[PDB]
Structures are given as C-alpha cells and as structure tokens.
Symmetry: C3
Subunit: 91 residues, 3 copies
C-alpha cells in the first residue's frame, strides 16, 4: 500500500530525536527529548525528505532537504525558528 | 526499473555500519564490523525506512523507523535485542 | 508529481554538508564547506541513495549506498577519490 516516507536525526546522549514524515506532499515533524513524543514546529511542502544535524557546543543545528519535482528546498533550524537556506541544485 | 530503498548509520572506531534495505514491504539489515559484511538480526515489515543512532559511552543505540501506510513503527536496538519503541505520529 | 530523492550527511562544526540527489537513475552531489554550495565529484547510477560518514580527526570518510533494482553499490570516499566498497546485499 502507499506509504509515508521518513527521515530521522538525533543528537546528544538523552538523546533528542527528530523524525520528519512526508505524506502526500506535506512534511511534518515529531520530536523526542526524553519525556514522550510531541509535535514539532516544522511544516513545509515536500514529497521526499532527508535531514542532517550537528552540534555547536550544546546548540543544535538542523538542515531538512524537502523535494518536490526536481526542486529541493533546504530548511534550517539554528535555535530561533525555521528559515529557508541557501541550498540550490540544478536538477 | 523498481529499486529497493536503503538507510544507513555508522558509529565508533571500527567503524560499525548498518545498512537497512526495504524491499517489497520487508526491511532487512546488513552489518559491517571491520571483518566483512554479514546479515543482521533486524527483520521487520515496512515499505520505507530511515535510521538514526547514537553512542552513550561505548553503548550503541539504534532507532529504525519503518513505515507502512501512515503508520511508522520505531524499532529500538539497545544492546539486547530489537524492541518496539514509543514513537507515534499523532497523540 | 514524481520527485527526486535525497540523502544528506554533515561533519564538524563549520559544518561541511553533502547532499546526494537521485534523479531519473542518476545520483549527483552538492557540497557546502561554509562558503557557498558547489557541485561535488560524486556521479554514480542509482534510483535511491543513502549515506553515512565519519571523521578521523579532520579527515572525512563517506559511504554512499546507491541502489538500482535489488543491487546496492557502496561508494567510498577516504580522501583520495570515490572507490567501490565491499558491500553486498547477500552472501
Ligand atoms: C491494502 C493494499 C492497498 C490499499 C493497496 C495496495 C496493496 C495493498 O495490500 P498490502 O497488504 O499492502 O499488499 C501490498 C504490499 C505488501 C506491498 C509491499 C505493495 C503493494 C501491496 C498491495 C502494492 C501497492 C499498492 C498501492 C500503492 C500506492 C503502492 C505504492 C503499492 O506498492 P508497494 O507498497 O511497493 O507494494 O496502492 P494502494 O495503497 O492504493 O492499494 C496496492
Ligand atoms: C529494465 C526496466 C524495467 C524492468 C522496468 C522499467 C524500466 C526498465 O528499464 P531501465 O533500463 O531500468 O530504464 C529505466 C530507467 C533507467 C529509469 C530511471 C526508470 C525506468 C526505466 C524503465 C522506469 C520505471 C519502470 C518501473 C518502475 C517500477 C519504476 C519505478 C520506474 O521508474 P524509474 O526507475 O524512476 O525510471 O517498472 P519495472 O521495474 O517493472 O520495469 C519501468
Ligand atoms: C503536476 C503533476 C504531475 C505531472 C503528475 C501527478 C500529479 C501532478 O500534480 P501535483 O500538483 O503534483 O499534484 C499531486 C500531488 C500534490 C501529490 C502529493 C501527488 C500527486 C499529484 C498529481 C500524484 C503523483 C503523480 C505522479 C507520480 C509519479 C507520483 C509519485 C505521484 O504521487 P504523489 O506525489 O505522492 O502524490 O505522476 P507524474 O509526476 O507523472 O504526474 C501524478
Ligand atoms: O523543542 C522543539 C523544537 O523547537 O525543537 C527544534 C526543532 O525540531 C523545532 O521544530 C521543534 O519545535
Ligand atoms: O545559516 C544558514 C546556512 O548558511 O547554513 C549552512 C548551509 O545550510 C546554508 O545553505 C544555509 O543557508
Ligand atoms: O552484531 C550484529 C548485530 O547484533 O549488531 C547490532 C544490530 O545491528 C543487530 O541487528 C545485529 O544483529
Ligand atoms: O528505550 C526506548 C525509547 O524510550 O528510546 C527513546 C525513544 O526512541 C523512544 O521512542 C523509545 O521508546
Ligand atoms: O571538496 C569536495 C569533495 O572532494 O569533498 C569530498 C567529496 O564530497 C567529494 O565528492 C567532493 O568533490
Ligand atoms: O574499502 C573501504 C571499506 O573497507 O570501508 C569499510 C566498509 O565501508 C567496506 O565495505 C569498504 O570496502
Ligand atoms: Zn505498500
Ligand atoms: Zn529504476
Ligand atoms: Zn508528487
């Protein structure tokens, strides 16, 4: 049957986990920080999703790559809300 | 042509790598621990797969997200067998 | 609509980022090292891609898993060009 597509990242030792789900063209986010799953602020269009993150000290930085057709849009979390990133590709 | 879908994670100083393949609704696992590839114990249903892992000291923790329909099931490896995680996509 | 499929990895604190895109049977690579996106050296066939990476000091080691059909080919970056890895899906 048709199935959603996911991408996952984690950081630290607790850990913090973020799982992105692409469902019928919309990506949403589920979060774990040690006390139960909850819904994240990320909501962007996309059929397909990948993610990577890195720590600067204790500060997390997340990059989500959301693709519709041949266009991939990068979204960035740097502690102060999601912003559109500079990524481009000539697909 | 129709193609399988993979997810990969790695850790530590060997390094240890784990590659999950979703093929026709079934997910399986191939492992590298420095001495050749071999088949892992993970076998769970799923059309799509993502994975993340983290170390706590020397202990690996792996989380594999297996999706069928709109249901994503989280599978947990924490040193002693695969168990179903608490992940849900809604509350 | 049909959409491309991506995978992403990053390392260090700058950070460096690599984003792999599978598009109509071909996987290509875009790169960030703090100073703008550019096209990387990776070009290999595949309908689906996953990736994992690890540092050895400042030196990055990347493993890209490229799938066509039921055949997943591992590509290896160890500082000196992309080479085919030992991964096989069965014994
Ligand atoms: C309950 C059910 C529904 C509502 C279906 C389908 C199936 C189905 O039975 P199920 O027990 O899941 O057996 C299947 C299993 C185990 C796999 C692995 C299948 C399919 C089926 C067959 C084929 C299938 C179907 C699809 C879609 C969109 C895809 C992508 C799709 O390919 P994919 O998931 O790779 O391969 O259509 P749709 O979801 O409307 O209908 C057809
Ligand atoms: C040998 C072979 C088989 C057995 C096929 C197909 C093709 C095929 O020739 P190939 O040399 O691979 O040329 C193609 C290439 C290079 C690409 C990139 C293609 C397709 C083909 C055509 C289209 C195609 C086909 C599919 C399926 C399920 C998909 C998803 C699919 O899309 P996708 O992989 O994005 O695009 O059907 P199926 O596997 O039954 O049959 C049809
Ligand atoms: C412009 C356009 C083209 C050229 C299409 C399709 C659609 C389409 O309109 P759009 O505004 O994108 O509305 C859709 C939206 C928003 C979603 C979420 C859709 C589809 C469509 C419909 C269905 C669809 C279509 C496909 C393919 C290959 C897939 C995988 C596919 O599933 P998926 O992306 O999950 O679901 O065929 P193809 O790209 O040839 O044709 C059909
Ligand atoms: O604390 C939750 C949160 O702020 O964590 C960082 C990002 O995952 C956000 O989308 C998410 O809402
Ligand atoms: O601060 C945001 C940014 O500079 O972070 C590094 C890369 O993800 C860039 O594409 C992105 O615009
Ligand atoms: O040594 C192999 C193994 O035990 O490693 C941890 C997990 O990847 C398991 O599924 C796998 O069988
Ligand atoms: O020990 C298992 C568990 O608590 O680990 C952290 C998260 O992956 C949870 O969903 C999961 O149930
Ligand atoms: O400096 C760019 C580069 O060498 O970085 C390592 C790999 O990502 C290569 O494919 C890529 O061309
Ligand atoms: O050649 C490099 C290599 O040994 O690195 C470890 C694994 O990725 C192997 O499959 C691969 O062949
Ligand atoms: Zn299915
Ligand atoms: Zn194909
Ligand atoms: Zn679409």
């Amino acid at each position: 049957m048709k199935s959603v597509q996911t991408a996952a990242t984690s950081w630290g030792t607790v850990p913090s986990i973020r799982v992105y789900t692409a469902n019928n063209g919309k990506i949403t986010e589920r979060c774990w920080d040690g006390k139960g799953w909850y819904t994240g602020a990320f909501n962007e269009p996309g059929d397909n999703v990948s993610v990577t993150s890195w720590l600067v000290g204790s500060a997390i930085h997340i990059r989500v790559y959301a693709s519709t057709g041949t266009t991939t849009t990068e979204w960035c979390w740097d502690g102060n809300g999601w912003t559109k990133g500079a990524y481009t590709a000539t697909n």
